[PDB]
């Protein structure tokens, strides 16, 4: 659910397609996800 959390930090408008494509890259690249989480917690 850090998924949904990262998405909401987007200022710019996005399409359902774009969101799903961002989501798929995130949920398939945990090392990238941790990087974003670490950015919020460091």
């Amino acid at each position: 659910s850090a998924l949904q959390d990262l998405l909401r930090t987007l200022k710019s408008p996005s399409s359902p397609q774009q969101q799903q494509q961002v989501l798929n890259i995130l949920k398939s690249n945990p090392q990238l996800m941790a990087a974003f989480i670490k950015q919020r917690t460091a």
Partner: protein, 203 residues
Amino acid sequence: LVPGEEWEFEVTAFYRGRQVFQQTISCPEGLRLVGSEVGDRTLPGWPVTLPDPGMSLTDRGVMSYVRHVLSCLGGGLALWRAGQWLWAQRLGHCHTYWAVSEELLPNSGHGPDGEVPKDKEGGVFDLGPFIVDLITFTEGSGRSPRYALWFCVGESWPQDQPWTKRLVMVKVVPTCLRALVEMARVGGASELENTVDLHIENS
């Protein structure tokens, strides 16, 4: 085939430097940059028709030449995703050279990354190095990962010469990659060089 694996592309076209077209497209078959009618859907990929230069230009010489390379696009410039790679192919008669670079500038002269193949498809972008560079960007490397694909159509890639001299330049941006880098910026990553010397009176 899995929903979300295909990529949404923002396609922006530049005739002689001037932006003349912009459209955001998302479909599983990818894109085909064409310059004419679409009564020939024998080819796969969503046909993106580049506009006639008469709609936005007044230079007759440029309009004539731009019309020519557009008409010679034939099947067009194909671009789609398969696996971790972005694939491109030149289906017409216009030699097309590409480079991955900055969103706002195709830049010169570090030369084109290569020429878009005709007979077989060629890989033009790898998601692999992108993500790796995005992570180190998040970790404060200061170097933002490139995701903008620029295509020079009908002419040699503009080295040393300004890209605005080219008749037909096209930018294609995977919007999901743009959003990822923005996520890093919002997270606190910056591209600002530490060599910035502000010229402001201090005395």
